[PDB]
Design an enzyme around this catalytic site. Structure first.
Site, PDB file in Angstrom:
ATOM      1  N   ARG A  37      33.827  61.165  17.806  1.00  0.00           N
ATOM      2  CA  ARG A  37      33.181  62.339  18.396  1.00  0.00           C
ATOM      3  C   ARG A  37      33.688  63.643  17.791  1.00  0.00           C
ATOM      4  O   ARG A  37      32.947  64.628  17.744  1.00  0.00           O
ATOM      5  CB  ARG A  37      33.375  62.378  19.902  1.00  0.00           C
ATOM      6  CG  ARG A  37      32.278  61.628  20.637  1.00  0.00           C
ATOM      7  CD  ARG A  37      32.510  61.592  22.130  1.00  0.00           C
ATOM      8  NE  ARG A  37      31.334  61.068  22.850  1.00  0.00           N
ATOM      9  CZ  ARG A  37      31.296  60.761  24.151  1.00  0.00           C
ATOM     10  NH1 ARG A  37      32.373  60.861  24.914  1.00  0.00           N
ATOM     11  NH2 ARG A  37      30.162  60.303  24.683  1.00  0.00           N
ATOM     12  N   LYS A 204      30.690  53.496  34.622  1.00  0.00           N
ATOM     13  CA  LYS A 204      30.123  54.670  35.293  1.00  0.00           C
ATOM     14  C   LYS A 204      28.958  54.254  36.159  1.00  0.00           C
ATOM     15  O   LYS A 204      27.815  54.655  35.930  1.00  0.00           O
ATOM     16  CB  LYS A 204      29.740  55.740  34.270  1.00  0.00           C
ATOM     17  CG  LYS A 204      30.989  56.477  33.796  1.00  0.00           C
ATOM     18  CD  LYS A 204      30.739  57.389  32.632  1.00  0.00           C
ATOM     19  CE  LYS A 204      32.023  58.088  32.205  1.00  0.00           C
ATOM     20  NZ  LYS A 204      31.754  59.109  31.148  1.00  0.00           N
ATOM     21  N   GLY A 362      31.038  57.059  24.225  1.00  0.00           N
ATOM     22  CA  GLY A 362      32.408  57.344  23.799  1.00  0.00           C
ATOM     23  C   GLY A 362      33.221  56.067  23.732  1.00  0.00           C
ATOM     24  O   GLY A 362      33.947  55.835  22.766  1.00  0.00           O
ATOM     25  N   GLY A 385      25.529  57.882  28.296  1.00  0.00           N
ATOM     26  CA  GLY A 385      24.574  58.311  29.322  1.00  0.00           C
ATOM     27  C   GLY A 385      23.545  59.255  28.736  1.00  0.00           C
ATOM     28  O   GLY A 385      22.401  59.205  29.082  1.00  0.00           O
TER      29      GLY A 385
HETATM   30  N1  LIG Z   1      34.145  44.943  34.764  1.00  0.00           N
HETATM   31  C1  LIG Z   1      34.605  46.145  34.484  1.00  0.00           C
HETATM   32  N2  LIG Z   1      35.421  46.721  35.346  1.00  0.00           N
HETATM   33  C2  LIG Z   1      35.946  47.926  35.109  1.00  0.00           C
HETATM   34  N3  LIG Z   1      35.695  48.586  33.991  1.00  0.00           N
HETATM   35  C3  LIG Z   1      34.893  48.027  33.059  1.00  0.00           C
HETATM   36  C4  LIG Z   1      34.325  46.788  33.283  1.00  0.00           C
HETATM   37  N4  LIG Z   1      33.564  46.500  32.223  1.00  0.00           N
HETATM   38  C5  LIG Z   1      33.672  47.515  31.366  1.00  0.00           C
HETATM   39  N5  LIG Z   1      34.477  48.453  31.869  1.00  0.00           N
HETATM   40  C6  LIG Z   1      34.868  49.714  31.271  1.00  0.00           C
HETATM   41  O1  LIG Z   1      33.700  50.473  30.941  1.00  0.00           O
HETATM   42  C7  LIG Z   1      34.274  51.595  30.269  1.00  0.00           C
HETATM   43  C8  LIG Z   1      33.178  52.319  29.491  1.00  0.00           C
HETATM   44  O2  LIG Z   1      32.096  52.670  30.344  1.00  0.00           O
HETATM   45  P1  LIG Z   1      31.333  54.047  30.011  1.00  0.00           P
HETATM   46  O3  LIG Z   1      32.293  55.189  30.072  1.00  0.00           O
HETATM   47  O4  LIG Z   1      30.187  54.169  31.068  1.00  0.00           O
HETATM   48  O5  LIG Z   1      30.673  53.766  28.568  1.00  0.00           O
HETATM   49  P2  LIG Z   1      30.539  54.870  27.400  1.00  0.00           P
HETATM   50  O6  LIG Z   1      31.842  55.603  27.194  1.00  0.00           O
HETATM   51  O7  LIG Z   1      30.060  54.053  26.188  1.00  0.00           O
HETATM   52  O8  LIG Z   1      29.366  55.790  27.894  1.00  0.00           O
HETATM   53  C9  LIG Z   1      35.311  50.999  29.290  1.00  0.00           C
HETATM   54  O9  LIG Z   1      36.440  51.836  29.321  1.00  0.00           O
HETATM   55  C10 LIG Z   1      35.588  49.616  29.913  1.00  0.00           C
HETATM   56  O10 LIG Z   1      36.998  49.369  30.089  1.00  0.00           O
HETATM   57 BR   LIG Z   2      30.006  57.371  37.669  1.00  0.00          BR
HETATM   58 MG   LIG Z   3      32.957  56.460  28.573  1.00  0.00          MG
END
Ligand SMILES: Nc1ncnc2c1ncn2[C@@H]1O[C@H](COP(=O)(O)OP(=O)(O)O)[C@@H](O)[C@H]1O
Ligand SMILES: [Br-]
Ligand SMILES: [Mg+2]
Length: 405
Positions: A37, A204, A362, A385
């Site tokens: 990023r 999230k 991210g 998102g």
């Molecule tokens: N079952 C789960 N329980 C808790 N956290 C999880 C689980 N599966 C994935 N994650 C977490 O999801 C996080 C990323 O989600 P998110 O922030 O929404 O995606 P991004 O950063 O690609 O937009 C990662 O840090 C990962 O550890």
């Molecule tokens: Br959230």
């Molecule tokens: Mg994230």
């Protein structure tokens, strides 16, 4: 951005540039785990400096400190250091982002100064929840730090936050990363190859469960995995989910989502098995569970299991286009990484036989960096998102706030 001012037509000579970027980089043991990023904003920053900007003041959030200063946990200071190497120019880090002392450091800088402000979300007025007259004054203060504004924060463009929509300067331009990402998606989303699979995982849940409704009018299949799945399984299967991520509000719409998926002929793939943990820790004790067995009280599902991975692979094999946001387990920790690794392997394989594969976010883009697949999928996006909101067909608030041409 045909209709919006962009950096290529913004006169920056002798102007102070205040620039919103998405420097919300992943961190682990206090170190940046992926500089994607940061690298992504370098072209806009370099362009400003090369075309005679007096200064570039960079502002971003990091994580979700919820409007309270948290320099010990969520400081942007480490980014400044990484930005220097990437830029080939030094960067001054300021310990706040407003008003009096920051305003002075930014008012009349040495020619060519690059300045990084501290975490915007250390202030409640950025989000601002976590206060009308103070939100106005927050925005006024940010507006003082440059003469012209650039938004290159694609990853945050879905957020109508102060730094993204509230800067009051005559010229508000989209940066080159914003343009690159919007252009890629406009083309990829215009007439998607079908079947078009969305893969939604991650953590999230409260936010992203609310995007499913609109996505269901665009895609032909959806994998709902990672942290997202447990809300669905509790409601649909009456599954015991222990301390796994659960969203109370989203639980109330799960059955309606499934009805709409049925109506729209969208096949939904949920996990059927799990790797469990006795606490949210890299070194947690681990176990196995299935939907039938449930997850024991006080244990959490942190990855899917082998039968789930097979079902995911089956959906990937059917897809001609994929957008993936959200790892399907806690892939940062090796004990919970196998499911995401397996899905990544399948997505890479799909790409090699002509699937259009888009991975964004991210954290999800960090999977690509971790397993060295950044060049083995069609597009890796800096937006998570943010990308999902484009898939829904929305105009992003950060784009909408730019100056009309
Ligand atoms: N079952 C789960 N329980 C808790 N956290 C999880 C689980 N599966 C994935 N994650 C977490 O999801 C996080 C990323 O989600 P998110 O922030 O929404 O995606 P991004 O950063 O690609 O937009 C990662 O840090 C990962 O550890
Ligand atoms: Br959230
Ligand atoms: Mg994230």
């Amino acid at each position: 951005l045909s209709n919006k001012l962009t950096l290529d037509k913004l006169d920056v000579k002798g102007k102070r540039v205040v620039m919103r970027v998405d420097f919300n980089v992943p961190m682990k043991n206090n170190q940046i785990t992926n500089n994607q990023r940061i690298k992504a904003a370098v072209p806009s920053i370099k362009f400003c400096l090369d075309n005679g900007a007096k200064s570039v003041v960079l502002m971003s959030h990091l994580g979700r400190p919820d409007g309270v200063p948290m320099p010990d946990k969520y400081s942007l200071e480490p980014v400044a250091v990484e930005l220097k190497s990437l830029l080939g120019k030094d960067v001054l880090f300021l310990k706040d982002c407003v008003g009096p002392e920051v305003e002075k450091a930014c008012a009349n800088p040495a020619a060519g100064s690059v300045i990084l402000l501290e975490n915007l979300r250390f202030h409640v007025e950025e989000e601002g929840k976590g206060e009308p007259a103070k939100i106005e004054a927050f925005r006024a203060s940010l507006s003082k730090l440059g003469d012209v504004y650039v938004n290159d924060a694609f990853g945050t463009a879905h957020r109508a936050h102060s730094s993204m929509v509230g800067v009051n300067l005559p010229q508000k331009a989209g940066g080159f990363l914003m343009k690159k990402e919007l252009n890629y998606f406009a083309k990829a989303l215009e007439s998607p190859e079908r079947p078009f699979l969305a893969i939604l995982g991650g953590a999230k849940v409260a936010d992203k469960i609310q995007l499913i409704n609109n996505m269901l009018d665009k895609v032909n299949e959806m994998i709902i995995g990672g942290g997202m799945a447990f809300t669905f399984l509790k409601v649909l299967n009456n599954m015991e989910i222990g301390t796994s991520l659960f969203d109370e509000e989203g639980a109330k719409i799960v059955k309606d989502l499934m009805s709409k998926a049925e109506k729209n002929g969208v096949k939904i793939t949920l996990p059927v098995d799990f790797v469990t943990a006795d606490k949210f820790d890299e070194n947690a004790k681990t176990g196995q569970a299935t939907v039938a067995s449930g997850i024991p009280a006080g244990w959490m599902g942190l990855d899917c299991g082998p039968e789930s991975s097979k079902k995911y692979a089956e959906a990937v094999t059917r897809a001609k286009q994929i957008v993936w946001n959200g790892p399907v387990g806690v892939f940062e920790w090796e004990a919970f990484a196998r499911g995401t690794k397996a899905l990544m392997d399948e997505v890479v394989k799909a790409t090699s036989r002509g699937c259009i594969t888009i991975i964004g976010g991210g954290d999800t883009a960090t999977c690509c960096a971790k397993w060295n697949t950044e060049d083995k999928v069609s597009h890796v996006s800096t937006g998570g998102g943010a990308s999902l909101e484009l898939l829904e067909g929305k105009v992003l608030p950060g784009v909408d706030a730019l100056s009309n041409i």
